[PDB]
Amino acid sequence: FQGMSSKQHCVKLNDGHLIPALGFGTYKPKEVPKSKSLEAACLALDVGYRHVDTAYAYQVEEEIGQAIQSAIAAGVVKREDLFVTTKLWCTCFRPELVKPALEKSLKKLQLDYVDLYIMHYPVPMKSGDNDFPVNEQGKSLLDTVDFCDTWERLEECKDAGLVKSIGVSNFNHRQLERILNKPGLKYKPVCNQVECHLYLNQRKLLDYCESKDIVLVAYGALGTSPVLLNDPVLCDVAKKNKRSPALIALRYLIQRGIVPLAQSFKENEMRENLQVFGFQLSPEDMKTLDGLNKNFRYLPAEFLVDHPEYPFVEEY
Ligand SMILES: Nc1ncnc2c1ncn2[C@@H]1O[C@@H]2COP(=O)(O)O[C@H]3[C@@H](O)[C@H](n4cnc5c(N)ncnc54)O[C@@H]3COP(=O)(O)O[C@H]2[C@H]1O
């Protein structure tokens, strides 16, 4: 199966590197065993995914690294043709913890570098082994760490060669401006990975990111409360184009310059999602899909809401 590499469909990042225009997500729900994460990642590489997105906090970096190593040994893919993203977690935002956390991720992934390393959120939490520290009342134990101070250490990780590109996740407009306007900035973020789909289409944040050559990367692209995939207008557009609702929802994002992370644990859905480059939506259908926006956030990260940098109070 032909690999969907940057050679096929890529987006140019503002540091010169290329990211494949469709990624494979690896968020693992509670109910899904880690053996299924490994199986799904192996199949994704087999059927042609080359952009693999993971995170320390998903707890499956080991399994993703095993899938990558087994695919390379089998001759499915070479390392230079893969684009691997992982993420720095809130409990390691203190500057002195950034590079050790990256090296820990690299060891778990069995990689010498990642293509993209991003701050998972703009909000830090208390350092320690627990990824979700709380007090007796269940409130999150937060920290005070300027994300610009954390950003400087991601810049150092890039200069050390441990990561090719650096970016952020779940930042809002004001927070991106803080990085872009920080004194002595070395590298702009190449991306802002956010929840984005037909019911939260991020038009305002996308406009801003485009104006700064920052790529918007979408998770929750199929809607993760209303069920996006059952939307009657979406399903009418799907029927008109002879494609599935999921493929319309992904194509909507692709045509707006967004890099979606598509994920399934079902092999047939993985392969279906790769067909997103085989059709395009008319301007009329894109306008119809624009009209579905609800500004509805399925993933509001409520565990961070007490912190002043909680990103989702502001309009964008
Ligand atoms: N071609 C196709 N036809 C029909 N259905 C299809 C399909 N391709 C995928 N799907 C289904 O769409 C569901 C939602 O995908 P989405 O990427 O929006 O949403 C993803 C992911 O973005 C979201 N999620 C939840 N918490 C998250 C977090 N903390 N970080 C990132 N993602 C999170 O949870 C979902 C996990 O994926 P999961 O496989 O359980 O659930 C998938 C999968 O069951």
List the defining traits of the structure above.
monomer; 316 residues; alpha/beta; TIM Barrel; eight-stranded parallel β-barrel; two-stranded antiparallel sheet; 10 strands; binds the ligand Nc1ncnc2c1ncn2[C@@H]1O[C@@H]2COP(=O)(O)O[C@H]3[C@@H](O)[C@H](n4cnc5c(N)ncnc54)O[C@@H]3COP(=O)(O)O[C@H]2[C@H]1O
Whole-number tally of structural domains: 1
Q: Which CATH first-tier class would you pick?
A: Alpha Beta
Side-by-side strand order of the widest sheet: 3-4-5-6-7-8-9-10
What would CATH call the homologous superfamily?
NADP-dependent oxidoreductase domain
Span of the ends, CA to CA = 40 Å
Instruction: Identify the overall geometry.
Output: globular
Please estimate the helix content: 25-40%
Give the topology string: H per helix, E per strand: EEEHEHEHEHEHEHEHHEHH
PDB class: oxidoreductase
Keywords: Cyclic di-AMP, Aldo-keto reductase, TIM barrel, oxidoreductase
Assembly: monomeric
Entry title: Crystal Structure of mouse RECON (AKR1C13) in complex with Cyclic di-AMP
